Symmetry: C4
Subunit: 218 residues, 4 copies
Amino acid sequence: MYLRITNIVESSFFTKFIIYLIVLNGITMGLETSKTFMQSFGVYTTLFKQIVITIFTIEIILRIYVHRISFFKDPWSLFDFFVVAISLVILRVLRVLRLFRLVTAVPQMRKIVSALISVIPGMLSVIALMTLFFYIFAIMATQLFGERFPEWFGTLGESFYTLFQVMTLESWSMGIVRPLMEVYPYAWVFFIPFIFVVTFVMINLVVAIIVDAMAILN
Amino acid sequence: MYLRITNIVESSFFTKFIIYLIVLNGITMGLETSKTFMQSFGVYTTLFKQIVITIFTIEIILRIYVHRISFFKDPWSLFDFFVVAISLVILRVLRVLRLFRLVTAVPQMRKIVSALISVIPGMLSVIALMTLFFYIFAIMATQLFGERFPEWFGTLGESFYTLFQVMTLESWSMGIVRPLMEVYPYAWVFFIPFIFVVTFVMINLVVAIIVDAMAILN
Amino acid sequence: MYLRITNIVESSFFTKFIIYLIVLNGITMGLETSKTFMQSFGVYTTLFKQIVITIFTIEIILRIYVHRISFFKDPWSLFDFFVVAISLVILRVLRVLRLFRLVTAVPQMRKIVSALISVIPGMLSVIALMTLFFYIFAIMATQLFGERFPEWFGTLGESFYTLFQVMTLESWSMGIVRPLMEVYPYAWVFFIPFIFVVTFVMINLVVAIIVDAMAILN
Amino acid sequence: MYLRITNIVESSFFTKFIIYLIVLNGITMGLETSKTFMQSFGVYTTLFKQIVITIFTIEIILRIYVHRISFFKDPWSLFDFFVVAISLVILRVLRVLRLFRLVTAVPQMRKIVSALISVIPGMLSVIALMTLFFYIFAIMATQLFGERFPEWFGTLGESFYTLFQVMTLESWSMGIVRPLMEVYPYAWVFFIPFIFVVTFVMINLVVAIIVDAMAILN
Ligand SMILES: CCCCCCCCCCCCCC(=O)OC[C@H](COP(=O)(O)OCC[N+](C)(C)C)OC(=O)CCCCCCCCCCCCC
Ligand SMILES: CCCCCCCCCCCCCC(=O)OC[C@H](COP(=O)(O)OCC[N+](C)(C)C)OC(=O)CCCCCCCCCCCCC
Ligand SMILES: CCCCCCCCCCCCCC(=O)OC[C@H](COP(=O)(O)OCC[N+](C)(C)C)OC(=O)CCCCCCCCCCCCC
Ligand SMILES: CCCCCCCCCCCCCC(=O)OC[C@H](COP(=O)(O)OCC[N+](C)(C)C)OC(=O)CCCCCCCCCCCCC
Ligand SMILES: CCCCCCCCCCCCCC(=O)OC[C@H](COP(=O)(O)OCC[N+](C)(C)C)OC(=O)CCCCCCCCCCCCC
Ligand SMILES: CCCCCCCCCCCCCC(=O)OC[C@H](COP(=O)(O)OCC[N+](C)(C)C)OC(=O)CCCCCCCCCCCCC
Ligand SMILES: CCCCCCCCCCCCCC(=O)OC[C@H](COP(=O)(O)OCC[N+](C)(C)C)OC(=O)CCCCCCCCCCCCC
Ligand SMILES: CCCCCCCCCCCCCC(=O)OC[C@H](COP(=O)(O)OCC[N+](C)(C)C)OC(=O)CCCCCCCCCCCCC
Ligand SMILES: CCCCCCCCCCCCO[C@@H]1O[C@H](CO)[C@@H](O[C@H]2O[C@H](CO)[C@@H](O)[C@H](O)[C@H]2O)[C@H](O)[C@H]1O
Ligand SMILES: CCCCCCCCCCCCO[C@@H]1O[C@H](CO)[C@@H](O[C@H]2O[C@H](CO)[C@@H](O)[C@H](O)[C@H]2O)[C@H](O)[C@H]1O
Ligand SMILES: [Ca+2]
């Protein structure tokens, strides 16, 4: 019977049925953002969501019965477990994460996702350096401009936020630095080098990725 | 006579004449955006456009007489057919699409266009993942901020639009997220990871393209 | 004497002296943007500029005496000729172009400039396609939104300008498309595909450059 | 004893202790940006910072005793020396730079930092050209628009700042060039080519980096 349960679990139709259920329920959560739709079919849609979640729970149970410890050493299975647990109870909205199951159920999506994920270890150094950079400048900015510009630099977290904004170049001058220089005429001395460093590091992060990809092909 | 009609259709001067006609008519549609020009020569320009379209129709007819089914299995010919059909009747403006005939008539333009087009199949996976990502976050954003920010997140389509805007980094913070945090102090928890994921995926989309190009050269 | 004049013209000290003169005169044009500096030394600076230009003219004359037709088949010499001619008379400001002589006089600068220039022929196709794209969309935009939005789409040139702005993503939505959709609710149908095409083409332009560079190295 | 002092200085535990001290003191400078934290523990935190700096001084002294001239021919040691000297006395805030010691103390951080630094010599040409470009256009912009737009082009430094802003595409049109064209209708003639050149040069700077990286791998 154990072998029968695993033959049922590992069959192409079992997973195809899962995928079809995921697609239907994604359509449902789309329709659910509509207020008038919920006035007509809110009952039936809530019902459909309840039955979908119980199905996914019973199926996770069966998949655990098939692989005892293998389930919890598997990043994809750990992900499916954790999203269905989240949904089993901000949390109301967080239920929508169960749609990322399409990634773990469809092999094409797994292929591309783990490709992306495997790019990450090679960036671990340049991230740390940039974090340190951000951290240091955040401190400086909070001390240089927090008292007079409390909403952008008044705390370390505000300074982090604004520095991130400056790095994306989003209104860095007309919205942050020119207003500063009305009070601190030499604030560009802080922000131009920052932008320079931040851009140069970003560029190298990208070039590194490219070369590492080439290295695994050649 | 069939062979005579195909010798006429496939000649360098037939296509050169088509190209010259396309260029003249593009000049005409440029001049047509001018109101005072239309006050002096509007009649003659409308006349010229009418005769151009009948010529392109008669020539599509001849090209069909030359290739029976080959015409409709050919992406370039399918394109020429569909644009001249559009123009044969928002539709008034859509007539201007007939200028993309310069691409299908000039071989250099075909070369570069199909180069671009052939880059696309290799991106098909990363597009799907990003779409799913957008779709999920659109739902969440609509539930988190639709009621209080109806013009940016009130519907799924509005949320898609604003999320796309955030991905291009166009006023993401001074125009969207800081206004949000005046009400939802922790909205950055939603948008920073979003930007992070969206940027990282874009970068990999680009690096993939680069390596695939290298793979077809080496 | 001809050989003596060419030995004088082609000597390392002749060009070193030119380079030193260029640097001094660039310093001068920097100091000249200052109004109070011009109140104290405006006379001497104008004098210095006059003598610099006569020197460059006499030296172009000598260089012509050395190479009769070679001078006018040489892109660098053609450039030096044309800038000194511009300065020999908006034109007041255009005199400042003579500082690009540092590029033609210093070999390192020539190396890098012609590297950049030689990247250009390989882009000639993708530029033409994008131009055609811009031209077509400019026409459409002028017809779709010129009457109601005269300052951004009222003419073909205005539409070109605004489309270029949208391509750089500079306020594309908060400043152009959301204001449009207050009147034309479906204007995103025009602008999102535009951005998509424009970005994709830009990306391929860049990837092409990269691969072409690799092709000349391998 | 000299050999004993160098055995103490070069030991893994000496550097591990330095690294732990750096991390603790970074935590401290983070906590120090908080005003209420300083009301409760400001005394103890200032005390901790004092003892940290004396420790780093005594340790730099020992490291000098170990390597006489080697210390001052070493870029990392020169950096540690210069930051601790800065902190030994705007300067109040500049003390925070001592956190970049984590880079010089951790080998992973040294690896990635010198990787970045070694990318730089290959860019030295394209930087100079771009600087010259900026300098020339700064002069022109100051003469074309300084009198009427004193806050953006009134001086050479203001023009540099605004040109840099335009290069990052940060409000280049809605904030700079459209306001200009209300007065100088043809100002786009200046700024579009500028953007074009500036973008093209940036792209080549990046492509160069990529190919140079490939050249050192193949
Ligand atoms: C895939 C491999 C790993 C990739 C992971 C990337 C790691 C990112 C590092 C983030 C480090 C955490 C920074 C941090 O402590 O943030 C704290 C702040 C606190 O927010 P808060 O003070 O509440 O915000 C102000 C809100 N307001 C106006 C309503 C008062 O919250 C914020 O302000 C958010 C700040 C975002 C800054 C992001 C820093 C990025 C550093 C470089 C990232 C990598 C670049 C390649
Ligand atoms: C390598 C660098 C890693 C960087 C990781 C950063 C992660 C932690 C950063 C978190 C930033 C949060 C900033 C923030 O929220 O500011 C608020 C607090 C205190 O502000 P304050 O308003 O005084 O609190 C009183 C409460 N109130 C509102 C009722 C008056 O302000 C604070 O409490 C700030 C506390 C800072 C903790 C520092 C963590 C440092 C990690 C180790 C770094 C080592 C680098 C060498
Ligand atoms: C060449 C290979 C294939 C490439 C194809 C790329 C595929 C793009 C996926 C788009 C999926 C469709 C999204 C969608 O359903 O859009 C619906 C909304 C409805 O508009 P609507 O609700 O009328 O807009 C609000 C207007 N207002 C203010 C007047 C009320 O209309 C919008 O808001 C437009 C939303 C645009 C979002 C674009 C999503 C991009 C996903 C990632 C794209 C690939 C990145 C590499
Ligand atoms: C993998 C993901 C693919 C994503 C493709 C997305 C393409 C479809 C998205 C279209 C978004 C359109 C949003 C929109 O226009 O909102 C309006 C409607 C209903 O709003 P509402 O205002 O209640 O309608 C009443 C009419 N009124 C104005 C007179 C009161 O709101 C709706 O009707 C929204 C309907 C959502 C349809 C969902 C399509 C899902 C495709 C399958 C996704 C599977 C993922 C696992
Ligand atoms: C190195 C190899 C060659 C590279 C060369 C690049 C070629 C660029 C193509 C430009 C084609 C010319 C477009 C054109 O006709 O522009 C006319 C307009 C007329 O200006 P106007 O109507 O006076 O402007 C409105 C001013 N206002 C508010 C005071 C009334 O003036 C403008 O609005 C300027 C429009 C700029 C549009 C740029 C079009 C770029 C197409 C794609 C470029 C290549 C991308 C890779
Ligand atoms: C492949 C495509 C290449 C694209 C190259 C584009 C270069 C030419 C575009 C120039 C755009 C200039 C737009 C412009 O300034 O608009 C003003 C004029 C007439 O406007 P309007 O206000 O009626 O003039 C009356 C004067 N006024 C103010 C006292 C009332 O409006 C015009 O006169 C527009 C004239 C359009 C000339 C079209 C040139 C087309 C080149 C061939 C394209 C073939 C493509 C198949
Ligand atoms: C790693 C290898 C080496 C990399 C080093 C990069 C070299 C950067 C070159 C910078 C050259 C110096 C330019 C300069 O003289 O700046 C002077 C201005 C004077 O500021 P000031 O007149 O006080 O600013 C106006 C402030 N206000 C409103 C309160 C009155 O201050 C500014 O406005 C700052 C201007 C920033 C312009 C940056 C120029 C970048 C050129 C291209 C950079 C390389 C691109 C790849
Ligand atoms: C290859 C190019 C390298 C570029 C490196 C640029 C580094 C130097 C640029 C510094 C820009 C500073 C601009 C600036 O602050 O403007 C103020 C001054 C004088 O303005 P002004 O307001 O008249 O001064 C009177 C004082 N006040 C306020 C009480 C009335 O305005 C000035 O004093 C400007 C002085 C310009 C010095 C030019 C340095 C040129 C380096 C050599 C370039 C050779 C290129 C061929
Ligand atoms: C793959 C990675 C996935 C990343 C997923 C990230 C999801 C994280 C969502 C963060 C959401 C933040 O948005 C959060 O919305 C809720 C909605 O009740 C607000 O909650 C509350 O806000 C204020 C509190 O006085 C009131 O208006 C109200 O009582 C309530 O709405 C939070 O204050 C806001 O900050
Ligand atoms: C390597 C490539 C180099 C590219 C170089 C590009 C340089 C081109 C410079 C374009 C300058 C445009 O800037 C131009 O400035 C002059 C200054 O008198 C203005 O000229 C005039 O404007 C109006 C006209 O009623 C009045 O204020 C005044 O009579 C006068 O100033 C132009 O209207 C403006 O459009
Ligand atoms: Ca912007």
